[PDB]
Structures are given as C-alpha cells and as structure tokens.
Ligand SMILES: Nc1ncnc2c1ncn2[C@@H]1O[C@H](COP(=O)(O)CP(=O)(O)OP(=O)(O)O)[C@@H](O)[C@H]1O
Ligand SMILES: Nc1ncnc2c1ncn2[C@@H]1O[C@H](COP(=O)(O)CP(=O)(O)OP(=O)(O)O)[C@@H](O)[C@H]1O
Ligand SMILES: CCC[C@@H]1C[C@@H](C(=O)N[C@@H]([C@H]2O[C@H](SC)[C@H](O)[C@@H](O)[C@H]2O)[C@H](C)Cl)N(C)C1
Ligand SMILES: CCC[C@@H]1C[C@@H](C(=O)N[C@@H]([C@H]2O[C@H](SC)[C@H](O)[C@@H](O)[C@H]2O)[C@H](C)Cl)N(C)C1
Ligand SMILES: [Mg+2]
C-alpha cells in the first residue's frame with residue numbers, strides 16, 4: 272500500500288527532525304482496518320517555542336509531493352498527495368499533549384501499540400497507556416433518551432420544512448435524522464463501539480433486517496421520495512423505541528411517536 | 538397562528554417574571570419568513586444571582602404544556618409543546634448579553650425591532666442596534682478556497698469509502714458535500730446571505746439550472762445511485778469552479794478536479 276510507504280516516511284522524518292518531539296498515529300491503520308481506500312492521520316507534537324511558525328507546508332511536501340493543502344474546521348492540516356492519498360496532520364505544541372486522555376471518549380481503543388510512532392520524552396507512551404483499553408459504555412438510559420428526543424426534534428422540524436416546500440432543507444435534516452437512527456440501531460442491537468463513527472463498517476456490523484429498514488429512510492431530492500423516507504424514518508424509530516423501552520426508562524413514548532405519525536397528513 | 542399565541546405568552550411571562558431581565562427573539566418571525574410550519578425561538582437573559590439554579594422546565598411549562606424537553610448539542614433547551622409547535626430557548630445570565638454583537642457573523646439581520654421581546658434596562662435594545670442591518674460579505678477568496686478545498690477533501694474521502702463498499706458512510710459524506718455545494722452555488726450566483734443556513738429558501742434563491750444539477754447529486758442508499766451522485770457532485774463543482782476562477786485566485790484548479798474525476802474508475 273502507498274499509505275504504508277507514506278506512514279514509514281512520517282516515522283522516518285518525525286524521528287530525525289529536531290522540531291518534532293512526538294508523533295501519534297490514529298485511525299484505521301492503528302485498528303487493523305486500513306486498506307487501499309484509507310487515509311493516513313497523525314498528531315505531530317512540536318517543540319513548544321517554534322510551534323506558531325512551524326513550516327508545515329514544506330514539511331508535508333517532504334513527506335511526499337502534494338496537490339492540495341488546507342486547514343480544516345478542526346484546525347487539522349489536510350493534504351491530498353499527488354498519488355491521491357489523503358493525509359490529516361494535526362500540528363500542536365508538545366505542551367498540548369494533555370489532549371490525549373480526552374481521546375478515550377471517542378471510541379473503543381483496544382490497542383495503543385500502532386499509535387506510538389515517535390516519542391522523545393516518553394510522555395506520549397505514558398498518555399497512550401492511560402487510554403489503552405478505553406471503551407465508552409454507550410448502552411445507557413441517557414443515550415437512549417437523547418437520541419429519541421434528538422430524533423423527534425429533528426423529524427418534526429424536517430416534516431414541517433417538507434410540508435412548506437423547502438425540499439432541499441428537508442433532505443439536509445433527513446441526513447441528520449439518519450445519523451441518529453444509526454446510533455439507535457447500534458443501541459438496539461448492542462453493537463455500539465462505532466458510535467461517533469456510526470456508519471463505519473455498517474454493512475458488516477448490523478442486521479440485514481435493520482439495514483434494509485434504514486435504506487428505506489433514504490431519499491433523493493424529490494417530494495414523494497422525501498415523504499416516504501420521513502414516514503419510514505418514523506416507523507423505524509417506533510420499532511426501535513418499542514425494543515429500547517424493555518431496557519430503559521424512556522421520556523419519548525410510543526404515544527408521542529404516534530402523534531408525530533398522525534401529523535404527516537395534517 | 539399557534540406560534541403567535543406562544544410568542545405572546547413568552548412576551549407576557551418574560552416581562553412579568555422578576556428573574557428575567559431581557560428576552561430576544563430570533564429566526565423567521567424576526568425576518569418576515571414566519572409561517573404555520575415555523576418554530577419559535579428566544580434567548581432568555583436571567584438576573585445573575587439566580588441563573589445557576591433556574592428551573593427552565595417549570596418556566597417553559599408556564600409558557601404552555603409540553604410533551605418533550607431536552608438540551609441539544611448546542612446546550613439549547615428544545616421543547617415540543619403539546620400542540621406540536623417546536624420551541625428553542627437559550628437561557629443565559631444577563632451578564633452574557635454581550636454575546637449579541639457576535640450574532641452578526643451568522644448572517645443578515647433585517648429587523649432588530651421584532652427581535653426585542655422584553656428589555657428591563659434598555660441594554661438589549663442597545664446591543665441589537667449594533668447589529669441592525671448588518672450582514673457578512675461571503676464573497677471572498679478565503680470562502681471560495683475553503684469550500685473548494687473542503688469539498689475536494691470530503692469528495693475524495695467519500696469516493697474511497699464508496700469504492701470500499703461502505704455505502705452508508707458514503708451517503709453520510711455525500712450529505713456533507715451537498716452543504717458545501719450549496720454554499721459554492723451561492724458564491725457563484727452571488728446570493729449568499731443564507732450561508733450557514735444554506736438550504737433555507739433554496740427553491741426560491743438559486744437558479745433552476747443549478748437546482749436541477751444539485752438534485753442530481755442526491756442518492757438513496759444504493760451503489761449505482763451513489764456513484765451517479767458522486768460523479769454529478771464533482772461535475773457540478775467543476776462547473777462552479779470555472780466561474781469562481783474568474784473572481785478569485787484558487788488553490789483548487791480544473792486539473793486537480795479532473796484528477797479526482799478520473800479517480801472514480803481507478
Ligand atoms: N465523529 C468522530 N468523532 C471523534 N472521533 C472520530 C469520529 N469519527 C472518526 N473518529 C476517529 O478518527 C479515526 C480516523 O477517522 P477517519 O479517517 O475519518 C475513518 P478511519 O476509521 O480511519 O477509516 P478509513 O480512513 O480507512 O476510511 C477513526 O478511526 C476514529 O478513531
Ligand atoms: N447553522 C446556523 N448557524 C448559526 N445560525 C443559524 C444557523 N442556521 C440558522 N441560523 C439562524 O437561526 C435562525 C433560526 O433557525 P431555524 O429555526 O433553524 C430556521 P428559521 O429561519 O427560523 O425558519 P423556520 O423555523 O420558520 O423553518 C435562522 O433564521 C438564522 O438566523
Ligand atoms: C483515538 C482517536 C483519536 C482521535 C483524534 C481526535 C480527532 O482529531 N478527530 C477529528 C476527526 O475528524 C474527522 S471525523 C469527524 C476525520 O475524518 C477524522 O480522521 C478525525 O481527524 C475531529 C476533531 Cl472529530 N478525535 C477526537 C479522536
Ligand atoms: C440573529 C441570529 C441569532 C442566532 C442565535 C445563535 C444560535 O443559538 N444558533 C443556534 C442554531 O442552531 C440550530 S441551526 C444550527 C437551530 O436550528 C437554530 O434555530 C439555532 O438555534 C446554534 C448555536 Cl448555531 N446563532 C449563532 C445566531
Ligand atoms: Mg482514516
């Protein structure tokens with residue numbers, strides 16, 4: 272894989288460069304899920320007093336020639352290399368390595384070994400041993416209530432804009448509804464490790480039954496298709512709620528979902 | 538309108554309640570766009586001493602009985618009243634009233650008069666006057682570049698996950714692409730006030746030609762429809778880039794977009 276050649280380059284350069292004190296890899300190549308379709312991604316920890324003006328544009332070209340480079344909404348440098356591999360490099364002071372513990376909340380981190388690329392001081396390895404084995408419990412009453420409330424809110428907003436004739440906006444809301452629904456399916460089927468990344472591995476991780484029901488909640492930009500998708504979204508959540516009620520005390524009841532259902536033809 | 542009755546109750550209670558110093562309304566009922574499909578929304582500014590313990594659930598019930606209340610991801614109290622009207626209420630200390638001037642970054646502020654629901658001290662009116670008539674100018678090289686780079690980033694990521702067979706994830710990414718594409722159309726057509734709310738009034742605000750093109754970038758959860766939508770997504774952005782390049786210096790060139798296009802079948 273071209274990706275692995277680039278990863279090796281990153282390891283090489285982060286070790287040899289005096290400006291870089293640590294490098295943490297994350298993503299699929301640290302979880303046995305890397306393939307030819309994957310990107311590569313790192314936190315690059317820099318000498319504190321040279322962090323502001325660090326020439327990351329030049330450093331990234333030293334990794335490999337690139338076609339495009341910009342800073343995304345998360346402050347991460349994103350590169351499209353000339354071989355079309357995407358790379359995400361988050362550059363920050365070594366003094367901000369204390370961000371790492373909060374990563375335990377992002378998902379299941381069974382192993383940390385592939386994450387350790389370079390570690391000048393030993394501090395990176397120490398932070399990683401704090402998150403190694405991290406596994407958020409997603410199967411909570413709190414989560415079930417938030418998702419059902421969040422869905423009801425978004426569904427009602429969506430059906431309203433649809434009734435107005437704001438079709439494109441109802442489609443946008445439907446995609447937000449869909450993310451929430453995936454999280455509900457993962458709750459109902461007790462396979463919720465891929466939580467924030469709810470669509471990762473979906474074809475491998477959920478029942479055909481609910482996959483097909485989810486597919487029915489999708490639509491192109493079309494009034495009739497949107498109405499069908501919105502209706503099927505509600506029906507699916509009604510199924511999920513009647514399953515989840517057995518496990519949690521829910522504030523969104525079948526009655527409340529029934530009122531939303533009736534509203535479609537109002 | 539049920540909405541107007543509820544706004545009236547909010548006006549009534551915010552005035553009379555000694556714990557509430559000011560109430561600012563926003564959204565479509567302050568922008569000449571309110572209708573039967575609208576929600577209602579307010580910032581409620583509380584006397585500083587009681588902000589910490591204020592029982593919002595109790596107060597919102599006084600506005601009208603509700604079927605559902607929860608805090609969304611923005612910390613907004615979101616309510617579905619028992620007549621199925623949606624309400625969004627942001628409770629803050631009076632001392633945070635100075636967040637108001639930053640609202641000018643969100644878009645055009647046509648009517649600060651309709652925004653003033655209650656103002657004990659005259660303070661709210663003063664902050665609102667600072668934003669009246671204001672709008673960002675979205676027509677910039679910085680915006681053209683970010684959107685084209687962000688689109689290219691998300692598109693290449695999305696086509697990779699589609700090729701992988703992660704269809705549900707490619708759909709999720711497609712919806713993110715779609716929002717970037719609406720902002721790009723708004724730049725090209727120079728109708729960019731509805732920027733963060735890019736799909737608001739979309740059917741009324743962009744040309745029939747670009748609406749039709751945008752509609753072809755949409756898909757249901759289906760391999761063939763997804764490949765069609767991803768191609769049409771890039772082709773639309775290629776059209777838009779050819780216009781934008783005349784106005785701004787752009788990092789994303791036609792040649793780069795063509796590399797991405799050829800990548801679909803590689
Ligand atoms: N919404 C989210 N919030 C927080 N962390 C997330 C997240 N989505 C993904 N992540 C984390 O960031 C890592 C990198 O994510 P991405 O590169 O977007 C997908 P990936 O799992 O690396 O697969 P891929 O790049 O091979 O397609 C993921 O493995 C996950 O640990
Ligand atoms: N993404 C965003 N970021 C920041 N502000 C936004 C935003 N989207 C919308 N807004 C602002 O928040 C106001 C209320 O938004 P919404 O209630 O979601 C839509 P609306 O314009 O009120 O129409 P509607 O409620 O009648 O359908 C908008 O009018 C706009 O001023
Ligand atoms: C052990 C996981 C480390 C991850 C590092 C950190 C992070 O930088 N995530 C990014 C996150 O952003 C998107 S997915 C929304 C990218 O596709 C992904 O590769 C990653 O860079 C955002 C801030 Cl969520 N995440 C919170 C967890
Ligand atoms: C005069 C506009 C005032 C608005 C008030 C403030 C706000 O609370 N916006 C909300 C925003 O959130 C979503 S749309 C993302 C809601 O649909 C919308 O009614 C509004 O409540 C988020 C924090 Cl962006 N926005 C930054 C601007
Ligand atoms: Mg990755």
Ligand SMILES: [Mg+2]
Pocket residue numbers: 298310311312359
């Ligand atoms: Mg990534």
Ligand SMILES: [Mg+2]
Pocket residue numbers: 564565566575576577578
């Ligand atoms: Mg509104």
Ligand SMILES: [Mg+2]
Pocket residue numbers: 564576577578625
């Ligand atoms: Mg609203």
Ligand SMILES: [Mg+2]
Pocket residue numbers: 595596598599
């Ligand atoms: Mg009461």
